[PDB]
């Protein structure tokens, strides 16, 4: 497990993504698109396409020391987003987990049912139509 | 630089490449030898060749053969050249270390792939189905298991095997068929009874209740056309040949069933995450496709469960190829490449590396 935690967070480092993440106290998000983690536009905070599939990483001050930084890592299932969307939030999900230490605590969100905790994170959550597309191929 | 995802199981071989949605190449991992073919041409050549099956319960013990397996699919199914793709491969839970190494020796010795990993095969069906923690539920046509998922790790130690699957199913449903007065005795017409299983059995949400109605009405009975033109109709054959899978002994097999299974690996885990566990079941495998398999397992599970507890048992409906879509996800992803073996890593230190970078 050592070991495997090594081999795990040396990979992480491998995500541009990442770097930075987790600094301060916030939210940031990125979404899938075509299997490859792309951070979303402060300017697109809140906005979430239906077709598509996100990481929200939430960065906040615990109660039990507020000096520090805690995470909860979301990630945000959008109700018409494609099989390879939402395997690959949900594995980013895990290597960001995996990037600050296993400190995060994971939450899967799905559209129209996401918890209180993701809720509060917005005063300004809008659901978009559309999203990008898959980056599967079709075999016919 | 296309990634290989190859899926290998006890029956079929699933084998593709990384960011396709589906397996381009699905046969049956069987090998033929003349008293070598593999697949559908081995069983054309049925009446001259004797066939076997390289995988026992999700594990390879016919090396030979799962080399022809391999050679087969690389070659012949697929036919690329193995040196130019690095090469993803599943492997059930538990698999020993001695197989791993193997695996690893045959892929880059023999096929000379330039990079290798090998992962588990129930962790691929979960992040397919969009989760990090859930308990999944793998049934085949070899094996059966249990293996819960937490952010991402497996928990070894609540990990459960039941040797009980798709081919024991298709052997029931070939004797029970016999009470009607049928006889499926030939690998072709065995072939034909796992057809009809395939398509008009289903599992019973109330199996005594069922078993009641199909006495008392025949509204529960399905005609099924042979390939010569007979048409056969079938009754309560249909939902007692997966009560199996709730109730082994019906073939003799003292063993709790995969409701039971389910619960005993729930407990395995610490308190903190059985309800995460609960609430995502995942079914992954071709065993799992019997229509009201999810319904019946929902009431197993809550009549286990506490009252309060919130039970959810999650059916993808493409759950046969459910490890092969994993596998086809994960290797589009470079960091999970980055973690896999390199050709010139195993040339140095050869096939003990998979212990330390396959996970
Ligand atoms: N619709 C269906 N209904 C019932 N059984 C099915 C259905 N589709 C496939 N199966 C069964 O699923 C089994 C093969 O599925 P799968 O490819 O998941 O297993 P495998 O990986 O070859 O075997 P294992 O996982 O046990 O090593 C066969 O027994 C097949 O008859
Ligand atoms: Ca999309
Ligand atoms: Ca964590
Ligand atoms: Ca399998
Ligand atoms: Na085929």
């Known amino acids: 497990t050592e070991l495997e935690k090594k081999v795990k967070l040396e990979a992480s480092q491998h995500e541009d993504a990442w770097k930075g993440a987790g600094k301060q106290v916030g939210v940031e998000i990125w979404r899938i698109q075509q299997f490859k983690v792309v951070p979303v536009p402060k300017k697109h905070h809140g906005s979430f396409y239906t077709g598509d599939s996100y990481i929200v990483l939430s960065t906040y001050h615990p109660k039990t020391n507020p000096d520090k930084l805690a995470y909860d890592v979301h990630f945000w299932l959008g109700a018409f987003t494609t099989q390879d969307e939402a395997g690959t939030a949900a594995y980013k999900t895990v290597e960001l987990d995996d990037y600050l230490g296993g400190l995060p605590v994971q939450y899967r969100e799905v559209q129209g049912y996401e918890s209180e905790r993701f809720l509060s994170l917005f005063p300004g959550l809008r659901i978009l139509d559309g999203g990008v597309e898959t980056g599967f191929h079709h075999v016919e | 630089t296309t990634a290989l995802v190859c899926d290998n199981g006890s029956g079929l071989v699933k084998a593709g490449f990384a960011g396709d949605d589906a397996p381009r190449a699905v046969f049956p991992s069987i090998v033929g030898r003349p008293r070598s073919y593999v697949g559908d041409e081995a069983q054309s050549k049925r009446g001259i060749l004797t066939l076997k099956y390289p995988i026992e319960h999700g594990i390879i013990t016919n090396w030979d053969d799962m080399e022809k397996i391999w050679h087969h699919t690389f070659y012949n199914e697929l036919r690329v050249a193995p040196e130019e793709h690095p090469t993803l491969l599943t492997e059930a839970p538990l698999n020993p270390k001695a197989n791993r190494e193997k695996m690893t020796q045959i892929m880059f010795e023999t096929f000379n792939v330039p990079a290798m990993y ?32 937490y952010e991402g790790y497996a928990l070894p130690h609540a990990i459960m095997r039941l040797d009980l699957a798709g081919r024991d199913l298709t052997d029931y449903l070939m004797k029970i068929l016999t009470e009607r007065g049928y006889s499926f005795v030939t690998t072709a017409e065995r072939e034909i009874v796992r057809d009809i299983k395939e398509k008009l059995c289903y599992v019973a949400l109330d199996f005594e209740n069922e078993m009641a109605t199909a006495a008392s009405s025949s509204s529960l009975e399905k005609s099924y056309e042979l390939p010569d033109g007979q048409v056969i109709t079938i009754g309560n054959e249909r939902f007692r040949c997966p009560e199996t899978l709730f109730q082994p002994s019906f073939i003799g097999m003292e063993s709790a069933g995969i409701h039971e299974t389910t619960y005993n690996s729930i407990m395995k885990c610490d308190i903190d995450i059985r309800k995460d566990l609960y609430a995502n079941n995942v079914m992954s495998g071709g065993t799992t496709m019997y229509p009201g398999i999810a319904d019946r397992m929902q009431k197993e599970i809550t009549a286990l469960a506490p009252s309060t507890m919130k039970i959810k048992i999650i059916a993808p409906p493409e759950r046969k190829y459910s490890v092969w879509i994993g596998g086809s996800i994960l290797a589009s992803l470079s960091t999970f490449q980055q973690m896999w073996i390199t050709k010139q890593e195993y040339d140095e230190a050869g096939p003990s590396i998979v212990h330390r970078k396959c996970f």
């Open chain 2, 118 to 149: 090998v992962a588990i095969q129930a962790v691929l069906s979960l992040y397919a189905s969009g989760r990090t923690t859930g308990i999944v539920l793998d049934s085949g046509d070899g094996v059966t298991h249990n293996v819960p998922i």
